[PDB]
Design an enzyme around this catalytic site. Structure first.
Site, PDB file in Angstrom:
ATOM      1  N   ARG A  50       5.494 -10.231  -7.848  1.00 62.20           N
ATOM      2  CA  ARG A  50       6.650  -9.564  -7.273  1.00 62.20           C
ATOM      3  C   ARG A  50       6.785 -10.105  -5.864  1.00 62.20           C
ATOM      4  NH1 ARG A  50       7.669  -4.145  -4.948  1.00 62.20           N
ATOM      5  NH2 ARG A  50       9.877  -3.600  -5.280  1.00 62.20           N
ATOM      6  N   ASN A 124      13.920  -2.549  -3.397  1.00 65.89           N
ATOM      7  CA  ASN A 124      12.687  -1.789  -3.253  1.00 65.89           C
ATOM      8  C   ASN A 124      12.975  -0.378  -2.759  1.00 65.89           C
ATOM      9  OD1 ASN A 124      10.106  -1.117  -1.052  1.00 65.89           O
ATOM     10  ND2 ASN A 124       9.627  -1.774  -3.147  1.00 65.89           N
ATOM     11  N   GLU A 125      12.558   0.622  -3.526  1.00 65.71           N
ATOM     12  CA  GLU A 125      12.508   1.996  -3.019  1.00 65.71           C
ATOM     13  C   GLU A 125      13.800   2.508  -2.384  1.00 65.71           C
ATOM     14  OE1 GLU A 125       8.946   2.189  -0.630  1.00 65.71           O
ATOM     15  OE2 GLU A 125       7.653   1.747  -2.362  1.00 65.71           O
ATOM     16  N   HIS A 190       6.512   3.582  -8.296  1.00 64.70           N
ATOM     17  CA  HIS A 190       5.468   3.168  -7.375  1.00 64.70           C
ATOM     18  C   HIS A 190       4.462   4.299  -7.273  1.00 64.70           C
ATOM     19  CE1 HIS A 190       8.296   0.063  -5.252  1.00 64.70           C
ATOM     20  NE2 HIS A 190       8.219  -0.087  -6.563  1.00 64.70           N
ATOM     21  N   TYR A 192       1.488   5.927  -5.567  1.00 61.28           N
ATOM     22  CA  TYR A 192       0.530   6.144  -4.495  1.00 61.28           C
ATOM     23  C   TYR A 192       0.046   7.588  -4.586  1.00 61.28           C
ATOM     24  CZ  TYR A 192       2.106   1.598  -2.842  1.00 61.28           C
ATOM     25  OH  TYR A 192       2.382   0.254  -2.736  1.00 61.28           O
ATOM     26  N   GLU A 220       4.607  -1.010  -7.905  1.00 60.58           N
ATOM     27  CA  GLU A 220       3.574  -1.004  -6.881  1.00 60.58           C
ATOM     28  C   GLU A 220       2.595   0.104  -7.225  1.00 60.58           C
ATOM     29  OE1 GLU A 220       4.971  -0.453  -2.899  1.00 60.58           O
ATOM     30  OE2 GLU A 220       6.642  -1.864  -3.126  1.00 60.58           O
ATOM     31  N   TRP A 247      -0.136  -3.576  -5.152  1.00 63.41           N
ATOM     32  CA  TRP A 247       0.283  -3.851  -3.773  1.00 63.41           C
ATOM     33  C   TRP A 247      -0.942  -3.980  -2.876  1.00 63.41           C
ATOM     34  CZ3 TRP A 247       5.106  -4.637  -1.665  1.00 63.41           C
ATOM     35  CH2 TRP A 247       5.137  -4.770  -0.278  1.00 63.41           C
TER      36      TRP A 247
END
Length: 294
Positions: A50, A124-125, A190, A192, A220, A247
């Site tokens: 990516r 992204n995001e 993503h 986290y 990610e 990531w």
């Protein structure tokens, strides 16, 4: 000939299911590292890279020659390139998404004809707030403009909430997909601390997408540090055929440098995190299979 989507499965141009197993590279912020970092990432067994690009909104814009350069380096190292525009990160404003869309259209000549090796992650995001409806409207508006420009690539759409509110995909993902006359759009979470905080959460977040017969990548994800359950992300992705992209290779700021996979751009000295992703159970060396187009 390109990637194709049917339900929750992504297929390469040979009709073979493709499960991304790969690595994010912060190209936009480290442009001259391309010829070291991209092949180094390939050496780790990644089937996909990516690539962080900038549309000039927040950082130095990646021009069309640069886009061609980095996709070419990926392809010539037998990796699928998921290109993404990073400047709209966390922003709710439609203007930021507009800028990303216009960027893809500006760069279409570097992208058209690469549909079997390049997947376009729109922004992204984009849409930091936890609002499924508003997030959806953005992409319902955006996707047709990309198609109209002649971009037939599989499109990857990040969940709302900086990628960490996958409820958005569960509730509105089909509406977003329906807006693609090509029916060739996949979704990304993503993971986290929120979206990947424990085993139950990882499994529930993956399920809430793929059980809607929508295709999913974990575009990610991170790891526990001074909680994110990378073990379950890795094992449950493998069980369900869900792709992932860790990531990130190198170059995080001090606050996030626990996320660097490698001490050096060349990958001769991986961090503990890099070792887990590359050499660990359900990691790259163990489970990554190249796209059959190569």
């Amino acid at each position: 000939s390109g990637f194709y989507v049917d339900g929750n499965t992504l297929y390469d141009a040979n009709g073979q299911p493709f499960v991304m197993k790969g690595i994010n590279h912060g190209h936009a912020w480290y442009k001259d590292t391309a010829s070291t970092a991209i092949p180094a990432i390939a050496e780790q067994g990644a089937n996909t890279i990516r690539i962080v690009l900038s549309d000039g909104g927040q950082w130095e814009k990646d021009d069309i020659d640069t886009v061609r350069e980095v996709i070419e380096l990926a392809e010539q190292n037998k990796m699928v390139a998921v290109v993404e525009v990073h400047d709209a990160t966390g922003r709710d404003s439609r203007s930021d998404l507009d800028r990303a869309v216009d960027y893809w259209i500006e760069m279409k000549d570097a992208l058209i004809g690469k549909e079997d090796t390049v997947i376009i992650n729109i922004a992204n995001e984009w849409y930091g707030s936890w609002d499924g409806a508003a997030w959806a409207d953005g992409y319902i508006d955006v996707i047709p403009k990309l198609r109209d420009a002649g971009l037939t690539h599989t499109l990857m759409v990040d969940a709302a909430g900086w990628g960490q509110y996958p409820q958005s995909i569960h509730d509105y993902g089909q509406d977003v997909f329906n807006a693609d006359p090509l029916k060739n759009t996949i979704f990304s979470i993503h993971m986290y601390e929120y979206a990947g905080g424990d085993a139950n959460t990882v499994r529930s977040n993956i399920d809430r997408v793929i059980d809607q017969d929508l295709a999913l990548v974990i575009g990610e994800f991170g790891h526990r540090h001074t909680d994110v359950d990378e073990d379950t992300i890795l094992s449950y992705s493998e069980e369900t055929g869900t792709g992932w992209l860790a990531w990130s290779w190198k170059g995080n700021s001090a606050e996030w440098d626990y996320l660097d996979l490698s001490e050096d751009w060349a990958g001769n000295h991986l961090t503990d995190w890099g070792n887990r992703i590359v050499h660990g159970a359900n990691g790259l060396q163990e489970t990554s299979k190249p796209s059959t187009v190569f």
